[PDB]
Amino acid sequence: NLSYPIGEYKPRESISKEQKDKWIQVLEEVPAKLKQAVEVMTDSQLDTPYRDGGWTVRQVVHHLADSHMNSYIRFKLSLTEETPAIRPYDEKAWSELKDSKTADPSGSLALLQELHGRWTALLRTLTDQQFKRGFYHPDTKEIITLENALGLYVWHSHHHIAHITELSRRMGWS
Amino acid sequence: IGEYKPRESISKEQKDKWIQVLEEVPAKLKQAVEVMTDSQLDTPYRDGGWTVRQVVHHLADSHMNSYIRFKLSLTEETPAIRPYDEKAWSELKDSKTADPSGSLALLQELHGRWTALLRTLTDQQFKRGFYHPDTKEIITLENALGLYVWHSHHHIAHITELSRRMGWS
Amino acid sequence: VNLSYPIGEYKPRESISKEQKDKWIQVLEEVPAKLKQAVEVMTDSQLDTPYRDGGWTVRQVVHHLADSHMNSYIRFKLSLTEETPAIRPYDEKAWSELKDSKTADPSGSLALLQELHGRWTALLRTLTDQQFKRGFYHPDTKEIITLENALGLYVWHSHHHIAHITELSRRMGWS
Amino acid sequence: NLSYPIGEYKPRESISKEQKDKWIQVLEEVPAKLKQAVEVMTDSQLDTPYRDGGWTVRQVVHHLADSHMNSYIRFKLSLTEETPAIRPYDEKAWSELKDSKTADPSGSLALLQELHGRWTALLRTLTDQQFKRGFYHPDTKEIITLENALGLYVWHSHHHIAHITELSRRMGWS
Ligand code: NI
Ligand code: NI
Ligand code: NI
Ligand code: NI
C-alpha cells in the first residue's frame, strides 16, 4: 500500500455535528502537521520520490496547496450556485511545472496555513442546510455534498502527509 | 485610474515591473486597512457598494481564482476558465464579517507563490492564453498579469480614497 | 553522500516544539541499547572491519560515539552556565587513531554511553524552554547552535553512526 | 582540615613507573570507594553539606562525574595535540544546576565506574613519552604533564571521597 497508506475516503449520508466540528479542527491543524514532516528535509530529501515512479515530497507539498485552493473555490461555488459543475484540473501536469519541481516548500506551507485558516472560518459559518449543498464533478459525473467534501479533504490531507512520513521513516530521516 | 489596455506585445522589462508590483500588493493593502476599526471596515467605499472588508476578502478570492487560471493556461491548450459570481461570494456571511487579518496573510503568501510561478515563465509561456466564456476573449497571460496589477491598484485606491475623504488615520 | 551519510544530515530549525523535544529526549535515552544490539553479535574480525572503504572500523565508531557524546554533554553544561560560550573543538580523526580506540573492547564504551545518555537525558528533562534556547559557539566553523538543535543533532549523530554499523552488517550478510 | 582532609596535590618533576602503576590501580578502584562512601545514605544525608559553606554530598558525587569527564577529555586532547590549551569550566555554576542538586547519585556512580574503566584502559596503553606530554590552563599558564594529571586526579578522587567519609564520621552515621 505505497500509494494509499490510509486507504480511501468513504462517503456517507449521515454526518453528525460533532463529526463535522472535529473534521474542521483536524483540517485547521493539517498545515502544521505537514510542516512537521517536511521541515526536517534537505533539498535532496525533498526531491526524493515518495514511492517508485511517484511524486517527490516537494511536489506533494505544492500539490496540497494547489488541490486545496481548488477545493476552497469549489466550496464557494457550491454555496453560491445550485449544484455547480466544477472545473477539473490536470494534477499531473500541474506537478510537472518547473515551479512545482523546484520551489522551496516554505511558501506553500505558509499558504496552506493561511488557506486552511480561511477555509475553516468559512466552514464554521455554514448552516446544516448549506452543508447539504453539493457540486458535480464533470469527469466522474458524481455529486458530492459539502459535508462529504470536508471528510474527503481531511482524508486527502492525511493521505499525502502519510506518503511523506512513511518515506521519512523508511529512509531513517527524522 | 483608467481601465487596463490589452497589448499585442509586452516587453520583458514591463513584465518584470508588473511582477514586482504584484509582489508588493499585499503589503500595500495591509498598510491601507490594518489600523481600521470594525466601523471603518464595514463602511461602503461608495453608496451602493462593497465595504472595505468585502474588498479585502474579494481580492483574496479573485486572486486565488486568477492563480488557478494561470496554472490551467500553462497545462492545457487555451482552456475555458470557470467564472464565479463575485457578488454572491461577497454576500456570504464570512465575507461580511471575517477579520481582514486572515485574508491579508493569505494574499501575502498567494502573491508569493504567484510571483514565483511568474518568474519561471518563458516569453512563450506568457503568450499562452485562456478563454473567458463571458467576454468571449482569449486573454494572454502577459495581459492577465497587467489586468491583475490594475485590479489590485483599482481596489486599493478605492480604500485609500475612502480614508482620505473621511479623514481616517 | 550515501556510504558516508546513509540517513542524510541533520537540518537545524528556527523552532523546535515541546512535543519534539520530549520525543528526542526519549530517543536519546534509548540510543545506547540500539547501538549495543548491533554490535553485541559481532566477532573481533567484524569489529575491526571498516564501515566503508577508507572509513573507521566498527570498533572505532563505537569509541567515537562515546568520545563525541561526552564532549557534547560538556558543551551542554557550558552553555547552561556561561553566556554563549565558545566550546573546545577536538580532532576526532586523531582521537580515533589512538591505540586504545583501535583495540579496546566495545563493552566499556557501550556501558559508558548507556550511563552518559542517562545523565544527559536527566539534565535535559530539568531544562526550561528558555534554557533550551541558550546557545554555544564553534570557534572554527563560526556556527552558533541552540541546545534544542544540538539535541536534534545528537539524536541524528546516534542514528547516523548506528546506520554505519547496521548498513555494514547488511552489505556483508552477517548474522 | 575540613576543606582539605588529605592536603593538596604536590606535583613532582618525575614519577616512577611504580608510582604510575599504583595510581592507575587507585583510579580503577575510585568508583567503588565512592559508592561505598554513599552506599546507605538517605536523601536527607545526601543533601547535607560536607562543611558549613559547602556542597552537599549529592553535589560532590555529581561533581566527580563532571570533573572526571572533563579530565578524560583533557587527556585525549593532550595525546592528539601539541601542548593544548584546555577549556576551563565553572565548577560552582555546574554544581548549582537543578540536576546537580537533585539527581539520585546512582547514575553518576555508574557513569564514574564506566568512565574510570575507559580512562585506566587509556592509561595502560600510554608510553613513557606520552605520559610526559602535557596541557596548559590558559590562565595559570602552567603546563601539567599527564603523569602529574594522573596524580592530581587520584588526589581529587580521594579528596572528595574524604569530604564524604569525614562528614559521616563527624555526624553519627558511620
Ligand atoms: Ni492528491
Ligand atoms: Ni474586483
Ligand atoms: Ni561522528
Ligand atoms: Ni573538586
XYZ file of C-alpha atoms and ligand atoms in Angstrom:
696
model
C 0.000 0.000 0.000
C 2.605 2.538 -1.155
C 0.040 4.670 -2.996
C -2.698 4.514 -0.324
C -1.194 4.309 3.195
C -4.519 5.088 4.995
C -6.976 3.700 2.416
C -9.571 5.856 0.619
C -12.389 8.201 1.739
C -15.768 6.544 2.425
C -18.766 8.885 1.892
C -21.925 8.682 3.989
C -25.368 10.319 4.058
C -25.263 10.821 7.822
C -22.598 13.067 9.273
C -23.145 14.396 12.794
C -22.451 17.894 14.108
C -19.709 16.500 16.348
C -18.090 14.766 13.363
C -18.216 17.903 11.212
C -16.816 20.040 14.041
C -13.983 17.537 14.599
C -13.091 17.422 10.897
C -12.958 21.247 10.848
C -10.488 21.151 13.736
C -8.445 18.430 12.011
C -8.430 20.460 8.774
C -7.190 23.583 10.570
C -4.322 21.509 12.026
C -3.214 19.914 8.689
C -0.651 22.565 7.647
C 1.218 22.307 10.955
C 1.333 18.535 10.673
C 2.608 18.767 7.093
C 5.227 21.328 8.130
C 6.398 18.998 10.941
C 7.001 16.261 8.367
C 8.740 18.354 5.726
C 10.821 20.957 7.612
C 13.388 18.271 8.576
C 14.296 17.639 4.969
C 17.212 18.917 2.907
C 16.839 19.561 -0.846
C 17.909 16.074 -1.891
C 15.416 14.554 0.595
C 12.660 16.863 -0.714
C 13.481 15.680 -4.237
C 13.158 12.025 -3.325
C 10.131 10.207 -4.785
C 7.741 9.080 -2.053
C 7.453 5.793 -3.963
C 8.950 4.366 -7.141
C 7.533 6.260 -10.124
C 5.779 8.822 -7.913
C 5.987 12.483 -6.999
C 8.764 13.878 -4.841
C 7.955 15.268 -1.377
C 8.431 18.756 -2.801
C 5.829 18.032 -5.496
C 3.421 16.637 -2.887
C 3.667 19.830 -0.813
C 2.926 22.040 -3.827
C 0.130 19.699 -4.870
C -1.577 20.034 -1.482
C -1.584 23.816 -1.909
C -2.929 23.660 -5.467
C -5.548 20.999 -4.671
C -6.810 22.756 -1.598
C -7.016 26.178 -3.308
C -9.185 24.440 -5.935
C -11.271 22.854 -3.164
C -11.865 26.155 -1.361
C -13.103 27.658 -4.611
C -15.383 24.685 -5.185
C -16.893 25.246 -1.723
C -17.689 28.894 -2.558
C -19.119 27.902 -5.965
C -21.359 25.358 -4.191
C -22.573 27.915 -1.694
C -23.458 30.469 -4.408
C -24.770 28.308 -7.300
C -27.148 25.339 -7.337
C -25.100 22.155 -7.675
C -22.452 23.698 -9.909
C -20.366 21.745 -12.345
C -16.825 22.389 -11.068
C -13.641 22.956 -13.067
C -11.277 19.984 -13.091
C -7.530 20.477 -13.362
C -4.796 18.109 -14.620
C -2.980 17.489 -11.327
C -0.205 15.532 -13.023
C 0.522 18.382 -15.453
C 0.421 20.949 -12.624
C 3.014 18.918 -10.693
C 5.344 18.837 -13.694
C 5.641 22.614 -13.992
C 9.194 23.796 -13.224
C 7.963 25.725 -10.195
C 6.306 22.611 -8.697
C 9.569 20.685 -9.092
C 11.924 23.388 -7.698
C 10.180 25.915 -5.364
C 11.066 25.746 -1.680
C 8.227 24.195 0.335
C 8.130 27.156 2.760
C 5.850 29.316 0.563
C 3.329 26.521 0.055
C 3.441 25.564 3.704
C 2.665 29.177 4.672
C -0.048 29.435 2.024
C -1.666 26.239 3.304
C -1.684 27.522 6.880
C -3.468 30.698 5.868
C -5.730 28.908 3.376
C -6.909 26.332 5.881
C -7.469 29.243 8.279
C -9.902 30.961 5.890
C -11.430 27.642 4.799
C -12.215 26.553 8.342
C -13.577 30.030 9.085
C -15.939 29.638 6.129
C -16.904 26.156 7.323
C -17.759 27.384 10.804
C -20.306 29.849 9.344
C -22.269 27.206 7.450
C -25.739 26.010 8.440
C -26.704 22.332 8.266
C -28.621 23.074 5.046
C -25.558 24.687 3.486
C -23.520 21.580 4.359
C -26.066 19.536 2.354
C -25.439 21.587 -0.783
C -23.199 19.877 -3.300
C -21.256 20.080 -6.532
C -20.921 17.934 -9.616
C -17.604 16.659 -10.984
C -17.893 16.673 -14.813
C -15.445 13.792 -15.418
C -16.630 11.343 -12.739
C -20.252 12.544 -13.011
C -20.623 12.207 -9.223
C -22.281 14.737 -6.921
C -20.657 15.328 -3.528
C -22.136 17.233 -0.587
C -20.044 19.792 1.278
C -20.072 17.692 4.458
C -18.631 14.744 2.473
C -16.183 17.084 0.730
C -14.955 18.153 4.183
C -14.391 14.485 5.068
C -12.722 13.906 1.706
C -10.207 16.695 2.183
C -9.373 15.658 5.738
C -8.603 12.291 4.109
C -6.643 13.884 1.224
C -4.541 15.878 3.659
C -3.590 12.878 5.757
C -3.166 10.573 2.777
C -0.431 12.799 1.375
C 1.087 13.520 4.811
C 1.366 9.751 5.300
C 3.190 9.413 1.946
C 5.808 11.765 3.303
C 6.161 10.400 6.854
C 6.279 6.836 5.537
C 9.147 7.778 3.240
C 10.913 9.562 6.114
C 10.558 6.519 8.377
C 11.678 4.075 5.655
C 14.827 6.110 4.959
C 15.795 6.746 8.608
C 15.363 10.513 8.344
C 13.807 12.375 11.308
C -7.003 55.377 -12.565
C -8.036 54.115 -16.012
C -9.069 50.718 -17.369
C -6.382 48.248 -18.321
C -5.393 48.381 -22.015
C -4.538 44.958 -23.548
C -1.430 44.913 -25.747
C -0.237 42.616 -28.557
C 3.231 42.604 -27.057
C 4.636 43.362 -23.641
C 8.331 43.919 -23.034
C 10.370 41.751 -20.675
C 11.093 44.951 -18.769
C 7.386 45.708 -18.286
C 6.600 42.147 -17.256
C 9.304 42.315 -14.603
C 7.980 45.645 -13.300
C 4.489 44.193 -13.041
C 5.716 41.056 -11.253
C 7.333 43.319 -8.679
C 4.211 45.441 -8.302
C 2.141 42.293 -7.853
C 4.573 41.101 -5.174
C 4.081 44.379 -3.279
C 0.251 44.437 -3.439
C -0.414 42.612 -0.172
C 1.833 44.941 1.877
C 0.096 47.976 0.297
C -3.358 46.584 1.090
C -2.270 45.797 4.654
C -0.957 49.351 5.110
C -4.354 50.675 3.891
C -6.548 48.641 6.268
C -4.586 47.332 9.277
C -5.387 50.251 11.640
C -9.115 50.203 10.840
C -11.856 49.615 13.358
C -14.814 47.395 12.562
C -16.879 50.529 11.992
C -14.434 51.672 9.290
C -14.094 48.159 7.771
C -17.860 47.883 7.392
C -18.220 51.259 5.704
C -19.055 51.056 1.985
C -16.340 52.682 -0.135
C -19.236 54.151 -2.135
C -23.001 54.458 -1.658
C -24.370 51.223 -3.173
C -21.077 49.455 -2.809
C -18.983 46.887 -1.035
C -17.382 47.569 2.324
C -13.625 47.733 2.818
C -13.870 44.313 4.494
C -15.687 42.816 1.500
C -12.996 44.283 -0.807
C -10.170 42.674 1.162
C -11.849 39.251 1.032
C -12.674 39.735 -2.646
C -9.023 40.392 -3.538
C -8.056 37.102 -1.914
C -10.857 35.230 -3.737
C -10.267 36.953 -7.082
C -6.521 36.391 -6.991
C -6.813 32.752 -5.931
C -9.069 32.229 -8.957
C -6.510 34.019 -11.110
C -3.580 31.933 -9.948
C -5.608 28.813 -10.788
C -6.361 30.244 -14.250
C -2.633 30.784 -14.817
C -1.898 27.116 -13.994
C -4.796 25.885 -16.189
C -3.406 28.004 -19.035
C 0.112 26.578 -18.635
C -1.104 22.956 -18.673
C -3.994 22.981 -21.179
C -4.313 24.364 -24.688
C -6.268 27.635 -24.374
C -8.602 26.454 -21.635
C -12.028 27.790 -20.946
C -11.854 29.057 -17.376
C -14.574 28.811 -14.741
C -16.294 32.129 -13.965
C -17.639 32.792 -10.481
C -20.405 35.016 -9.124
C -18.275 37.655 -7.392
C -21.275 39.483 -5.970
C -22.655 36.292 -4.409
C -19.267 35.402 -2.932
C -19.080 38.876 -1.359
C -22.531 38.393 0.179
C -21.577 35.260 2.108
C -21.653 35.845 5.842
C -17.952 35.052 6.085
C -17.163 37.819 3.548
C -19.192 40.311 5.504
C -17.790 39.517 8.928
C -14.371 37.845 8.892
C -11.472 39.880 10.156
C -9.150 41.073 7.365
C -6.045 39.567 9.020
C -6.544 36.072 7.578
C -7.173 37.263 4.040
C -4.266 39.700 4.218
C -1.946 36.858 5.310
C -3.344 34.597 2.602
C -2.873 37.287 -0.052
C 0.758 37.719 1.044
C 1.511 34.028 0.622
C -0.595 33.692 -2.534
C 1.159 36.568 -4.240
C 4.463 34.989 -3.098
C 3.704 31.743 -4.924
C 2.108 33.549 -7.872
C 5.131 35.773 -8.493
C 7.389 32.743 -8.041
C 5.420 30.997 -10.795
C 5.630 34.141 -12.973
C 9.414 34.335 -12.650
C 9.751 30.820 -14.054
C 7.814 31.566 -17.232
C 9.381 31.856 -20.660
C 8.258 34.515 -23.110
C 6.306 31.830 -24.992
C 4.508 30.724 -21.809
C 3.443 34.351 -21.294
C 1.872 34.260 -24.743
C -0.327 31.302 -23.766
C -3.902 32.261 -23.077
C -7.252 31.298 -21.663
C -10.782 31.840 -22.830
C -13.274 33.680 -20.720
C -16.659 32.290 -21.727
C -18.445 35.514 -20.642
C -16.414 38.110 -22.618
C -15.525 35.558 -25.366
C -11.952 36.781 -25.476
C -8.666 34.901 -25.485
C -6.560 36.658 -22.856
C -2.785 36.010 -22.859
C -1.041 35.518 -19.510
C 1.066 38.629 -20.008
C -2.102 40.692 -20.460
C -3.716 38.932 -17.460
C -0.714 39.993 -15.385
C -1.416 43.601 -16.441
C -5.094 43.193 -15.675
C -4.465 41.920 -12.157
C -1.995 44.703 -11.430
C -4.765 47.132 -12.454
C -7.298 45.161 -10.362
C -5.119 45.439 -7.274
C -4.462 49.147 -7.702
C -8.103 49.928 -8.506
C -9.350 48.274 -5.245
C -6.568 49.654 -3.064
C -7.308 53.177 -4.418
C -10.984 52.797 -3.510
C -9.896 52.062 0.071
C -7.336 54.867 0.432
C -9.732 57.357 -1.206
C -12.398 56.449 1.378
C -9.981 57.031 4.254
C -8.902 60.326 2.753
C -12.472 61.615 2.313
C -13.467 60.516 5.789
C -10.299 61.838 7.419
C -9.347 58.496 8.949
C -5.792 57.794 10.162
C 26.697 11.007 0.122
C 25.287 7.526 0.871
C 28.044 5.257 2.236
C 29.219 8.142 4.450
C 25.768 9.649 5.027
C 23.291 6.769 4.987
C 20.462 8.778 6.578
C 21.453 12.230 5.289
C 22.407 15.111 7.568
C 20.735 16.999 10.356
C 18.855 20.113 9.262
C 18.560 22.703 12.047
C 15.284 24.550 12.557
C 14.489 28.030 13.845
C 11.992 26.473 16.268
C 11.543 23.105 17.992
C 8.277 22.157 19.730
C 7.829 20.890 23.285
C 6.491 17.631 21.802
C 9.519 17.194 19.526
C 11.920 17.850 22.403
C 10.182 15.262 24.560
C 10.389 12.667 21.768
C 14.043 13.409 21.158
C 14.851 13.071 24.863
C 13.214 9.640 24.816
C 15.061 8.572 21.655
C 18.394 9.750 23.059
C 17.856 7.756 26.231
C 17.311 4.561 24.228
C 20.111 5.079 21.641
C 22.747 3.105 23.568
C 20.625 -0.080 23.712
C 20.145 0.142 19.934
C 23.907 0.501 19.362
C 24.563 -2.434 21.679
C 22.001 -4.530 19.735
C 24.023 -4.046 16.548
C 27.491 -4.604 17.981
C 26.704 -7.403 20.500
C 26.560 -10.068 17.790
C 29.914 -9.270 16.218
C 33.210 -11.131 16.255
C 36.500 -9.259 16.672
C 37.191 -9.603 12.939
C 33.828 -7.920 12.307
C 34.530 -5.213 14.876
C 37.742 -4.439 13.015
C 36.015 -4.138 9.654
C 35.767 -0.661 8.104
C 32.171 0.575 7.783
C 33.098 1.696 4.269
C 36.214 1.767 2.102
C 38.647 4.189 3.765
C 36.425 4.505 6.844
C 36.707 3.773 10.532
C 36.145 0.271 11.870
C 33.004 -0.572 13.762
C 35.144 -0.642 16.920
C 36.369 2.891 16.204
C 32.782 4.108 15.575
C 31.691 2.808 18.947
C 34.523 4.533 20.805
C 33.890 7.706 18.742
C 30.274 7.843 19.856
C 31.397 7.738 23.493
C 34.015 10.468 22.952
C 31.745 12.667 20.859
C 28.832 12.447 23.252
C 30.984 13.132 26.327
C 32.194 16.225 24.533
C 28.573 17.178 23.772
C 27.400 16.726 27.359
C 30.162 19.061 28.486
C 29.086 21.570 25.809
C 25.522 21.498 27.180
C 26.692 22.272 30.713
C 28.993 25.057 29.448
C 26.010 26.509 27.561
C 23.829 26.464 30.678
C 26.383 28.192 32.925
C 28.034 30.702 30.542
C 26.582 33.183 28.029
C 27.042 31.659 24.566
C 30.378 30.044 25.384
C 32.924 29.218 22.730
C 33.360 25.461 23.050
C 36.559 23.402 22.687
C 36.986 21.613 19.357
C 38.638 18.194 19.313
C 40.348 16.338 16.490
C 38.001 13.373 16.027
C 40.249 11.666 13.463
C 43.257 11.856 15.764
C 41.210 10.560 18.750
C 40.087 7.548 16.668
C 43.657 6.732 15.672
C 44.814 6.304 19.284
C 45.795 2.720 20.026
C 43.007 2.470 22.608
C 40.353 3.474 20.099
C 41.576 0.865 17.626
C 41.781 -2.009 20.114
C 39.592 -1.635 23.244
C 36.616 -3.961 23.511
C 33.376 -2.077 22.704
C 31.802 -3.181 26.017
C 33.194 -0.374 28.156
C 32.150 2.286 25.686
C 28.698 0.789 25.264
C 28.227 0.823 29.031
C 29.638 4.305 29.293
C 27.257 5.536 26.591
C 24.308 3.972 28.417
C 25.119 5.826 31.652
C 26.079 9.070 29.910
C 22.862 9.181 27.934
C 21.081 8.517 31.259
C 22.636 11.589 32.918
C 22.327 13.670 29.746
C 18.584 12.985 29.411
C 18.087 13.665 33.136
C 19.736 17.057 32.582
C 17.559 17.678 29.548
C 14.374 16.986 31.459
C 15.222 19.656 34.064
C 15.547 22.392 31.441
C 13.098 25.228 30.919
C 12.055 26.264 27.407
C 14.266 29.307 27.852
C 17.324 27.199 28.737
C 16.734 25.163 25.586
C 17.047 28.382 23.585
C 20.525 29.061 25.015
C 23.335 28.502 22.504
C 27.027 27.820 22.053
C 29.661 28.872 19.548
C 32.089 26.804 17.492
C 35.295 28.850 17.064
C 36.337 27.013 13.858
C 33.048 26.819 11.892
C 31.780 30.147 13.296
C 28.385 28.499 13.875
C 26.013 29.237 16.710
C 23.723 26.395 17.713
C 20.949 26.293 20.315
C 20.604 23.484 22.816
C 17.308 22.295 21.289
C 19.006 21.998 17.892
C 22.085 20.329 19.468
C 19.642 17.772 20.917
C 18.278 17.133 17.418
C 21.835 16.963 16.075
C 22.943 14.331 18.572
C 19.864 12.195 18.020
C 20.895 12.363 14.360
C 24.542 11.572 15.196
C 23.462 8.495 17.120
C 21.237 7.217 14.270
C 23.878 8.089 11.641
C 26.664 6.010 13.224
C 24.306 3.181 14.176
C 23.322 3.135 10.495
C 27.034 2.951 9.548
C 27.247 -0.261 11.538
C 23.926 -1.855 10.544
C 24.422 -0.996 6.862
C 27.777 -2.771 7.036
C 26.284 -5.936 8.511
C 23.638 -5.899 5.782
C 26.093 -5.374 2.917
C 28.256 -8.138 4.375
C 25.397 -10.566 5.062
C 26.392 -11.078 8.715
C 24.110 -12.515 11.392
C 41.476 20.262 57.788
C 37.776 20.294 56.849
C 38.222 21.809 53.399
C 41.339 19.695 52.694
C 41.136 16.428 54.626
C 44.127 14.921 52.777
C 46.017 18.126 51.988
C 46.666 19.391 48.457
C 48.350 17.687 45.458
C 52.078 18.398 45.148
C 53.379 17.925 41.586
C 56.761 16.229 41.055
C 59.359 16.682 38.306
C 59.349 12.947 37.653
C 57.212 9.986 38.607
C 58.374 6.405 38.721
C 56.816 3.597 36.766
C 55.929 2.009 40.117
C 54.060 5.124 41.256
C 52.283 5.475 37.911
C 51.105 1.863 38.050
C 49.886 2.240 41.631
C 47.957 5.362 40.678
C 46.306 3.643 37.698
C 45.114 0.918 40.094
C 43.810 3.519 42.551
C 41.928 5.245 39.751
C 40.303 1.945 38.715
C 39.070 1.487 42.288
C 37.812 5.036 42.941
C 34.212 4.487 41.782
C 33.768 1.519 44.136
C 35.223 3.563 47.023
C 32.859 6.435 46.238
C 29.931 4.051 46.049
C 30.886 2.626 49.466
C 31.073 6.143 50.938
C 27.485 6.924 49.982
C 26.106 3.390 49.983
C 23.493 3.546 52.730
C 22.663 7.211 52.610
C 19.141 8.608 52.789
C 18.153 11.639 50.744
C 18.469 13.888 53.806
C 22.050 12.577 54.311
C 22.831 13.155 50.607
C 21.569 16.711 50.986
C 23.816 17.507 53.914
C 26.709 19.917 53.210
C 30.133 18.366 53.766
C 31.134 21.574 55.649
C 29.309 24.805 56.543
C 29.823 26.845 53.367
C 29.944 23.723 51.251
C 28.443 21.434 48.651
C 26.144 18.603 49.652
C 27.267 15.006 49.415
C 24.966 14.689 46.383
C 26.644 17.647 44.664
C 30.074 16.135 45.384
C 29.097 12.879 43.657
C 27.851 14.662 40.547
C 30.912 16.979 40.593
C 33.257 13.990 40.441
C 31.453 12.699 37.367
C 31.668 16.095 35.667
C 35.242 16.824 36.695
C 36.499 13.441 35.607
C 34.716 13.558 32.247
C 36.437 16.875 31.678
C 39.774 15.348 32.729
C 39.453 12.333 30.452
C 38.789 14.713 27.530
C 41.870 16.736 28.510
C 43.990 13.564 28.393
C 42.820 12.864 24.850
C 43.416 16.484 23.777
C 46.927 16.166 25.191
C 47.626 12.979 23.318
C 46.449 14.341 19.985
C 47.582 18.000 20.035
C 50.902 19.677 20.882
C 50.573 21.032 24.432
C 46.958 22.125 24.002
C 45.277 24.911 25.892
C 42.387 23.248 27.714
C 38.902 24.643 28.300
C 38.138 25.638 31.912
C 34.611 25.231 33.258
C 32.772 26.945 36.149
C 32.701 24.177 38.815
C 30.498 26.194 41.137
C 27.903 27.008 38.448
C 27.755 23.412 37.207
C 27.121 22.324 40.799
C 24.324 24.876 41.187
C 22.304 23.427 38.267
C 18.981 21.869 39.395
C 20.145 18.473 38.142
C 23.327 18.590 40.273
C 21.302 19.450 43.361
C 18.589 16.846 42.912
C 19.521 13.804 40.777
C 19.953 10.449 42.521
C 23.634 9.543 42.818
C 23.095 6.170 41.088
C 23.573 7.363 37.503
C 26.708 9.345 38.313
C 28.177 6.444 40.289
C 27.544 4.137 37.318
C 28.939 6.701 34.878
C 32.039 7.094 37.005
C 32.581 3.338 37.095
C 32.489 3.107 33.304
C 34.455 6.311 32.772
C 37.248 5.213 35.124
C 37.335 1.880 33.307
C 37.876 3.591 29.941
C 40.275 6.079 31.489
C 42.526 3.444 33.076
C 42.379 1.464 29.816
C 43.698 4.502 28.013
C 46.394 4.983 30.652
C 47.593 1.391 30.325
C 48.226 1.971 26.581
C 50.434 5.016 27.072
C 54.192 5.064 26.569
C 56.527 6.831 28.979
C 56.886 9.578 26.399
C 53.132 10.057 26.067
C 52.929 10.371 29.850
C 55.387 13.329 29.590
C 53.048 15.167 27.209
C 51.130 17.964 28.883
C 48.485 20.657 28.590
C 48.107 24.173 29.892
C 45.457 26.253 31.650
C 45.138 29.432 29.545
C 45.067 31.470 32.783
C 47.614 29.794 35.085
C 49.795 29.163 32.013
C 51.129 26.203 33.986
C 51.967 23.129 31.918
C 50.905 19.919 33.612
C 52.139 16.557 32.341
C 49.820 13.594 32.039
C 51.704 11.740 34.746
C 51.127 14.672 37.117
C 47.492 14.918 35.994
C 47.151 11.262 36.969
C 48.472 12.099 40.457
C 46.178 15.128 40.649
C 43.029 13.107 39.807
C 43.958 10.359 42.234
C 44.219 13.151 44.794
C 40.961 14.716 43.594
C 39.156 11.437 43.909
C 40.285 10.807 47.467
C 39.909 14.456 48.474
C 36.180 14.407 47.678
C 35.673 10.869 48.971
C 37.248 12.083 52.245
C 34.825 15.030 52.338
C 32.053 12.442 52.406
C 33.569 9.861 54.785
C 34.681 12.582 57.212
C 31.146 14.039 57.214
C 29.704 10.586 58.051
C 32.239 10.226 60.866
C 31.572 13.719 62.319
C 27.845 13.076 62.209
C 26.575 9.849 63.726
C 26.301 7.896 60.511
C 29.361 5.632 60.058
Ni -3.727 14.371 -4.114
Ni -12.709 43.489 -8.105
Ni 30.607 11.300 14.276
Ni 36.729 19.068 43.011
